Ligand binder design. Structure first.
Ligand SMILES: Nc1ncnc2c1ncn2[C@@H]1O[C@H](COP(=O)(O)OP(=O)(O)O)[C@@H](O)[C@H]1O
Ligand SMILES: [Mg+2]
Ligand SMILES: [Mg+2]
Length: 356
């Protein structure tokens, strides 16, 4: 079994995703995403081997007929998914990039001498890296996995196949305290002006933590307003809101549609309703009560009520979120909130492996 991601980090964390070019993985239909993982010889889990984009049904080449059953098998692109590490842990970041580049060279040899065969659990030649196979019911095949033989491909990685995910303490979003926080706050959907706006609305209120409440308000309102903007732009069905009732033609498959995710640029990966937990019951009530009018002064009553209710009931920004991540003291953990960079910006390029 592939180990689950560690959930706790002392400070800000980073994970990477890297879709490979030059090969596919074929597995039985409805297989689990993870088929293996690469770890250091010391035992530290570095990245997972996963199936990513479905490339169609697998057809075992006739010249490679082996008496085996490949019925209903699907081909997918391979994505290398790192185990998160601390953002300032240079050695952990470097070992992940190096282990990914090593596995690409091992894949290049595998499609040359063992095309349409499963990867074997081996140790690298220098002894640095170890492959562990968790699902042996797979095959690795060059190109799109149609031909028995490769076109002598070198297995590569490129920025268009790359993403980075950053995890920060929820209480830090809006403080601009670290370079990571400042990069996250530069997200086009985040409206820092909502912090000072909240303070103006709540002068008569005796709030337990005014600065924290203003930060949470700005973060949540920015997400709710962006969701409403996107639902209108792309014609997305949110809860009971119907875009056709506002003469908007549906132009996306939902919140999880890749073009909707891309429109966020910096995609929230944590369930918005979790942040309410970093506040007192009283402060959370004050924050939540003030969000509704921010939507209603910009969007129709139906869109506003539906977006507000969707997130209130634990609605996700774009599918299953990373909601169990924590930061700070191991004994008293604080909520970490995660963000996916759809395109890796210049500031995070050094975290990604490069073939060239
Ligand atoms: N605590 C964390 N801090 C930072 N990045 C994390 C953390 N936990 C997971 N990630 C990263 O989240 C990314 C996507 O994770 P995952 O949920 O497995 O992908 P998917 O939803 O596409 O199946 C990976 O780059 C991974 O390293
Ligand atoms: Mg992934
Ligand atoms: Mg991604």
């Amino acid at each position: 079994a592939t180990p689950d991601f560690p959930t706790h980090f002392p400070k800000s964390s980073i994970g990477i995703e890297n879709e490979l070019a030059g090969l596919v993985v074929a597995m039985p239909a409805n297989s689990a995403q993870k088929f293996g993982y690469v770890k250091s010889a010391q035992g530290d889990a570095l990245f997972m081997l996963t199936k990513d984009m479905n490339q169609g049904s697998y057809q075992r080449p006739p010249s490679l007929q082996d008496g085996k059953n490949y019925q209903n098998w699907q081909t997918h692109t391979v994505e290398l998914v790192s185990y998160p590490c601390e953002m300032d842990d240079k050695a952990a970041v470097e070992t992940r990039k190096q282990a990914m580049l090593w596995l690409a060279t091992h894949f290049t040899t595998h499609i040359d001498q063992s095309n349409h065969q499963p990867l074997a659990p081996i140790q690298s030649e220098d002894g640095r890296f170890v492959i562990e196979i968790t699902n042996a019911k797979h095959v690795i095949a060059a190109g799109n996995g149609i031909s028995a033989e490769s076109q002598g491909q070198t297995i590569t990685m490129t920025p268009s196949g790359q993403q980075a995910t950053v995890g920060v303490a929820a209480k830090g979003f809006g403080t601009s305290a670290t370079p990571e926080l400042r990069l996250l706050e530069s997200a086009p959907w985040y409206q820092k002006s909502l912090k000072s706006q909240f303070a103006s609305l709540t002068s008569a209120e005796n709030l337990d933590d005014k600065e924290l409440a203003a930060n949470v308000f700005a973060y949540l309102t920015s997400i709710y307003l962006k969701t409403a903007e996107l639902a209108k732009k792309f014609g997305i069905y949110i809860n009971e809101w119907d875009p056709m009732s506002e003469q908007i033609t549906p132009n996306a498959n939902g919140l999880t549609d890749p073009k909707v995710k891309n429109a966020w640029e910096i995609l929230p990966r944590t369930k918005p309703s979790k942040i309410v937990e970093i506040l007192s019951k009283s402060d959370a009530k004050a924050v939540m009560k003030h969000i509704k009018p921010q939507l209603q002064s910009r969007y129709s009553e139906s869109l506003s009520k539906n977006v507000f209710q969707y997130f209130q009931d634990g609605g996700e920004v774009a599918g299953h979120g990373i909601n169990n991540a924590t930061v700070g003291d191991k004994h008293s953990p604080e909520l970490a909130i995660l963000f996916e960079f759809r395109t890796v910006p210049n500031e995070l390029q050094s975290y990604l492996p490069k073939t060239e």
